[PDB]
Design an enzyme around this catalytic site. Sequence first.
Site, PDB file in Angstrom:
ATOM      1  CD  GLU D  60      -2.242   1.707   2.524  1.00 59.61           C
ATOM      2  OE1 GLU D  60      -1.362   2.481   2.951  1.00 59.61           O
ATOM      3  OE2 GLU D  60      -3.302   1.458   3.143  1.00 59.61           O
ATOM      4  CG  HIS D  61       3.581   2.459   3.089  1.00 62.16           C
ATOM      5  ND1 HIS D  61       4.435   2.634   4.159  1.00 62.16           N
ATOM      6  CD2 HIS D  61       2.374   2.916   3.497  1.00 62.16           C
ATOM      7  CE1 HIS D  61       3.776   3.180   5.164  1.00 62.16           C
ATOM      8  NE2 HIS D  61       2.523   3.362   4.789  1.00 62.16           N
ATOM      9  CD  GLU D 137       3.072   5.070   7.854  1.00 64.61           C
ATOM     10  OE1 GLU D 137       2.230   4.177   7.640  1.00 64.61           O
ATOM     11  OE2 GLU D 137       3.241   6.049   7.093  1.00 64.61           O
TER      12      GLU D 137
END
Lengths: 220, 421, 101, 444
Positions: D60-61, D137
């Site tokens: 997703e990154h 994160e």
Amino acid sequence: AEQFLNIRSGAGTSSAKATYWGGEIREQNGHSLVHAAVVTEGAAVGSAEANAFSVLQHVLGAGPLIKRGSSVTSKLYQGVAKATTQPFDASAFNVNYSDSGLFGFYTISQAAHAGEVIRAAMNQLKAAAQGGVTEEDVTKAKNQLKATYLMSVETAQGLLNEIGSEALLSGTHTAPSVVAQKIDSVTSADVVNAAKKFVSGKKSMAASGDLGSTPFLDEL
Amino acid sequence: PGAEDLEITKLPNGLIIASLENFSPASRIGVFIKAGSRYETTANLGTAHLLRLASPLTTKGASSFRITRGIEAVGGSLSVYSTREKMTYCVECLRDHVDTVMEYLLNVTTAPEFRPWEVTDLQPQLKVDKAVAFQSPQVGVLENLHAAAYKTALANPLYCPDYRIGKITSEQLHHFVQNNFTSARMALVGIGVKHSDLKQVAEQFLNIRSGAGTSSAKATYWGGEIREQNGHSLVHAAVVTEGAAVGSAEANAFSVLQHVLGAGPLIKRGSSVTSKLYQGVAKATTQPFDASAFNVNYSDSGLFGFYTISQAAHAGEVIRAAMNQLKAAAQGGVTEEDVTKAKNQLKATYLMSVETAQGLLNEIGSEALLSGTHTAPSVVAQKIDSVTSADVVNAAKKFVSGKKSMAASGDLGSTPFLDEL
Amino acid sequence: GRLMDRIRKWYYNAAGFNKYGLMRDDTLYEDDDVKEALKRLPEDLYNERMFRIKRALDLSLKHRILPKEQWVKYEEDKPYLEPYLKEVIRERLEREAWNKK
Amino acid sequence: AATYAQTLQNIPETNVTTLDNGLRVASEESSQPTCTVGVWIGAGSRYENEKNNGAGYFVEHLAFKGTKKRPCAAFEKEVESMGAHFNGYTSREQTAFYIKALSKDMPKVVELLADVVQNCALEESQIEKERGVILQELKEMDNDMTNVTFDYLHATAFQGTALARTVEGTTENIKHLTRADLASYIDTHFKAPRMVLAAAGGISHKELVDAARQHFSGVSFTYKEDAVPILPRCRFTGSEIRARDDALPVAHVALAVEGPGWADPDNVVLHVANAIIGRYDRTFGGGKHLSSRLAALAVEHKLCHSFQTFNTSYSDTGLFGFHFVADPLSIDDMMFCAQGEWMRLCTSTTESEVKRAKNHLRSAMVAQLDGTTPVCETIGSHLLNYGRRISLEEWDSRISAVDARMVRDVCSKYIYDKCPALAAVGPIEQLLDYNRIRSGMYWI
């Protein structure tokens, strides 16, 4: 002192040179009383230019000498009195720091009559920055200062504080007659000049009360 | 079928009505008003804020109780949003429940009772509502910004100052309501409804009538800097200058200079290349951060500049870099294309802003209030791209030239003073 | 009718709480409604009602009363709480009825 | 004027057409000049194994750090410059990458979506950067109690299974995942039969369906490629996990029972129920007059800073419960009152309550279609999860079908006497004993 003290030798941390900002901080808080202090760079501790303000201080008036009395020998007070109607107080503010200093006035006034008070306090500083100082005003102040100084040392606390401050920021004790010769050796000019350095320099104000009617540094 | 128009009658007393049926299964009515912290005086500060929270208190027609149980009985909602100069009381609900949810809307805005006890019981709430808000430093520097950038009206905080908590009176409220919530300052917008009805309503019921009451004091410009040392590992800074006013000709110029310098990422966790400000600041610093184009348009004034969140140590280099990048753009550092790309991002952003029933109703509203007309979507387009490569570079100049007023809150240790930029 | 309007003045003098300087509302038993009501009274009316009572208590402890002159007079008795009390009850009856719906 | 009854029908139907490779295309055409379109992949952390936990997130990154047909700078530049907003996400059973742009660029967008899923660059150098970034994160998200709480909920609720995993993954997995596994994950999961191109806004199903045909190329040969793999079921376990730190300011408590799963019609009733108990936080203006009993008491006794009911659904399972945040010293009364309400559900719900709950749910469902993105999200998920799209008109029928009697039977069915999962974080000393909490699962 010798056979007892341990943290030793050195200057350790060096205080960072004190820069000058010249800003104005205001605090709206609701108080029926607005306090204001408008100043500009003053003289440093030691700076011969200090004996000047100390006097310009006593010429503008600095701290009543008659219980519940009006200060006539106080130009600032007297001038501000003509300008406002309700209760108040205004004085000459003077601070002498190692590498700097502060100087100006300070006014406690009713929130409504804050404008007229601080303004009046100003003109009364400018009017003095323009030869508005009698050879006598300088004469009366020169004493009040010599007096105040002398009485300050009746207190065991006051004396010890005098003897101290010197032995620290110098390493010597300036005889009481030397400081006298130093105080009266201040020209009618030196004073008027100090008053100028104020009107000319960059001011930095500070006020806390219901500042609603109080003026901004850029309005003086 | 479904599609066409947006009426906008302008009744006797100067009250406005702006309807637009879009056949959505749900209606969303709202009362826009010219009110806010801007009309507050040292004497009644925060009274606006409280009035916002006071929405659920008993009215002459509906009880604190029925207002909530009533609007809730039909899966409806009710809220108040406000800037320093505008207040909006809107309610949502299924179509069939508009008339019902209206009674309270009508009551809350025109017929409040502000009962001493109810008021007093409520007041301590400002202590809270305000504390949740201030959780985002983002809002701390903004309150102070407006203060250092002004001397009045807009310089007034959006959240009741601390000392005034619990000192506001039922009078202060009424008076504030009597003086500012007047027909000529109010607009009854509304999506998902037929203009005829919204009109019929506004007429027979809206009984606060004509006036202009209190007049906001002209917003002067101070140009001061407020700093708050608080220890945070993150320094927030906002350096701005007098900007454009609402609708100002000069306005759109900044809106574009904004999008040219970059204003709010479009790629999740991505770098903004189309963002000069971001890109330039990135070259200057090393550690995490964010910097954007700040733009505010107020009735008689506006603000404009950048805003930077950076590590306390790399605050200097960040804010400085943020500057040169504003100057280098104030000197023909704007490509004919940069103006081209921004012109779109603005058109785009604008358009998407109105997919939200809240966003649409806010657009239709703002106009019907600070004008009395609805500027067609193609008109605003023609207005936005009709901005020269110069207008933009000029806006950039007005910034580098004008008197700046900064506002920063964090471990300002390494942060610079306005007179060092 | 203007009949029991003669009666009330009688009963009023009959009860004789004025002999203590208490208003009619000062004697109300503090049930839940009354309680809310009192909480709504303006600072002054409340402190006045407060002293009035504490006075009456100091009398009852002493086993005395007020001199005839100071007795509250049937038509000078201030029904300060009744307006509020009626409301508290209205609001409640509202809520009450509504929760059955 | 036009009633709700009708506005529900005049809503443009959702067009759905599959392509020879399994991929499905769907869209709700509107008058809107602007729009949103993206691919809703049926992949998540649930699909991850214990050694590649977090790939779907590491991916997703890198989904926006460039493709092969166009590196980072170009890719980003190309998107920004057209004023399009590219975003996405990744959950346990669902990943999604969608774009917000002007109905015009609609087709150049589809190309982009396609290039992202199919040709992600995965630059060896970008991977070493996203590594420290994710790691960051994780440390930031570690300070979001609400999260640390739901993960812990799952972690124990579905202990020993896939659903018991965090979407971000372990620390080791972040520190070691390879260009390989990442590569593998994409090739293994981002496949047409498991993808849906959803579009909402001013777009023609046709033009759209064509752009897909054009860029969503590659045809499957074997049968294994067009086989939507069924997932090994996740077992629910009544249990608890308590993360105590009296140094935290407030405590978090989340309690739940096992849910049916997307398919089951009961999910509707369950939601009606949840609407009766609702939610609350210190800034609700209704205060002591709110209709939700739990919110009421929450105010009368200052039980919690906030609370919320939730009905998280999954393909074959789900979590039904509530989560409240409170001061260390009111945890107990709060939980007590809360469980009480649950019990109040299986035993004495009134038609009065449901009638209202329905109206709240109706406005709630409509509120989830307030924009192209939200409408697109609903389409992307509906197909993927329900096997098609369910119109607001359909829903509304299913909701008008619910009556008190129905709510009681459904809640009893899933709540009454069940052993729940409990997640407590913070200064939780006052809330105690699973036993005591378990006994709160019965008797009015």
